Amino acid sequence: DIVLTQSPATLSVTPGNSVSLSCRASQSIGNNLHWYQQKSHESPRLLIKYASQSISGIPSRFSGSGSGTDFTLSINSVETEDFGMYFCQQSNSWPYTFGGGTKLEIK
Amino acid sequence: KVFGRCELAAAMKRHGLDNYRGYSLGNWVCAAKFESNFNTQATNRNTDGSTDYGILQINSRWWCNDGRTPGSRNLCNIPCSALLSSDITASVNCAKKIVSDGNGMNAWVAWRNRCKGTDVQAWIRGCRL
Amino acid sequence: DVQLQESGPSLVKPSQTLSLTCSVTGDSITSDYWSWIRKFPGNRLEYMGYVSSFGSTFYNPSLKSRISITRDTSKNQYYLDLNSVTTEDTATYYCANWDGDYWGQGTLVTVSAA
């Protein structure tokens, strides 16, 4: 299956600062990479679809880029409501797979 | 707009269709050739009352809503009128959902009749990607 | 608008079949592709499979063909069956549409001899 690797596993940051999360695929997946956010006691929430396409209802400070094997989720001016887990998931090939996740917490 | 063969190949690769769910890029360029002749404005009304729209002729009975087709499901959750842009984004997004059904690309009749079984890679050869 | 909700036993025995139900409100199930995802301890997410509007099913090989996804249009629900479970199947189960726009609340199912 396609392996998705997210780094760093954890990232501490102070509100207001910008950050970028990484997700690399074991093989090329074109633009078929989606980003999810997941908080405690809650279900995942789609943030970005197809590498860079925006999702209505999501703060605009979230953006994604990348293609092939390297993708990035960027957060401009991190807010406290952004602390939690972030997962990338590919839909290029069956079975769909998820990255191991990157944890975002206040520093 | 009417895409040039190589121009659509590059765009489609940029839009992640190269090896999407087991289908090589050639399949998608070939499908567009025989489905709409590379024209993002192509529209064809059908015998069952539905209509196919765009570069990839997305049907109004199952995938998009045109409001005049009986028994529509609108799986791609989008108005057919929105799949007629020179920007292939919307059509690619819906096509990916279409091909993710068990029927694969067989959903595209022209692809099935003119591409399946042929050297589809010929449609991307001689192109700068 | 659309809302999803999982229901079913939260505690099951090893070797039995774990079954869950996802009830959809707001629109017909025939109007979308439906999926099942689960979360293991340690933030590990696994995509279990999905069923298209035309009934085609796709299952993750990791499940070793122990999974079955079905639908009941009259009840506007779809289901998850996982046979011969073991403690390795304890996880939080979620239903969501294929696009990822709609998700259930997730329900924890624990597999234990007790």
Q: What is the DSSP track for A17-86?
A: --EEEEEEESS--TT-EEEEEE-TTS--EEEEETTTEE-TTS-TTEEEEEETTEEEEEESS--GGG-EEE
Output DSSP code: residue B80.
Answer: G
CB atoms within 10 A of CB C114: 5
Experimental method: X-ray
Segments of B1-103 assigned E as strands: 43-45, 51-53, 58-59
> What gap in Å lies between CA C96 and CA C56, rounded to an integer?
17
Spell out which residues of chain A touch residue B15, defining contact as CB-CB under 8 Å: 30-31
Strand partners, C89: none
Spell out which residues of chain C touch residue A38, defining contact as CB-CB under 8 Å: 43
Spell out which residues of chain A touch residue B22, defining contact as CB-CB under 8 Å: 93
Q: Do the Cβ atoms of C17 and C114 come closer than 8 Å?
A: no
How far, CA to CA in Å, does C75 sit from each of C23, C28, C70?
8, 10, 12
Q: How many domains does the structure of chain C reveal?
A: 1
Q: Do the Cβ atoms of A7 and A102 come closer than 8 Å?
A: yes
Active site residue B35: yes
Calculate how close chain C gets to B6, using CA atoms only, in Å.
30
Structure tokens at A29: 């997946």
Q: What is the Rg, in whole angstroms, of the alpha carbon atoms belonging to chain B? A: 14
Q: What is the Rg, in whole angstroms, of the alpha carbon atoms belonging to chain A? A: 13
Q: Which residue of A has its CA nearest to B92?
A: A50
A59 cis-preceded (ω within 30 degrees of 0): no
Residue among B17, B93, B100 minimizing CB distance to A30: B17
> What gap in Å lies between CA C80 and CA C72, rounded to an integer?
12
**CB contact (8 A) between residue B13 and residue A32:** no
Residue among A32, A51, A53 minimizing CB distance to B20: A32
Residue type, C93: Y
Percent helix / strand / coil, chain B, rounded to 5: 40, 10, 50
Output DSSP code: residue B62.
Answer: T
Q: What is the Rg, in whole angstroms, of the alpha carbon atoms belonging to chain C? A: 13
Helix (H, G, I), strand (E, B) or coil at A95: coil
Helix (H, G, I), strand (E, B) or coil at C67: strand
> What gap in Å lies between CA B75 and CA B65, rounded to an integer?
9
Residues in chain A, total: 107
Q: Beta C57-59 vs C67-72: how paired, if at all?
A: unpaired
Pick from A29, A52, A92, A96 the residue to mutate for testing the B interface (most B CBs within 10 Å). Answer: A92
Domain ranges of chain A: 1-107
Calculate how close chain B gets to C28, using CA atoms only, in Å.
9
User: Which residue has tokens 């069923």?
Assistant: C51
How far, CA to CA in Å, does B73 sit from each of B76, B101, C29, C77, C79?
9, 14, 10, 17, 21
Q: Where are the alpha helices (DSSP H) in C27-81?
A: none
By C-alpha distance, which of B73, B7, B75, B76 is closest to B40?
Answer: B7
Architecture per CATH, domain B1-129, reads as: Orthogonal Bundle (1.10)
| Annotated binding-site residue? B87 | no
Choice among B7, B52, B66, B119 that is catalytic: B52
Burial class (CB in 10 A: 0-12, 13-18, 19+), B63: buried
Strand partners, A4: A25
How far, CA to CA in Å, does A25 sit from each of A17, A19, A50, A67, C8?
27, 20, 14, 10, 35
End-to-end CA distance of chain C: 40
Structural domain boundaries, residue C9: 1-114
Residue type, C67: I
Q: Beta A4-7 vs A53-54: how paired, if at all?
A: unpaired
Burial class (CB in 10 A: 0-12, 13-18, 19+), B66: buried
Question: Which are the contacts of B127, defined by CB distance < 8 A and separation ≥ 6?
Answer: B5, B6, B9, B10
Q: Do the Cβ atoms of A48 and A37 come closer than 8 Å?
A: no
Instruction: List the CATH number of the domain containing C45.
Output: 2.60.40.10
Check: CATH 2.30.40.10 for A1-107? no
> What gap in Å lies between CA C56 and CA B97, rounded to an integer?
13
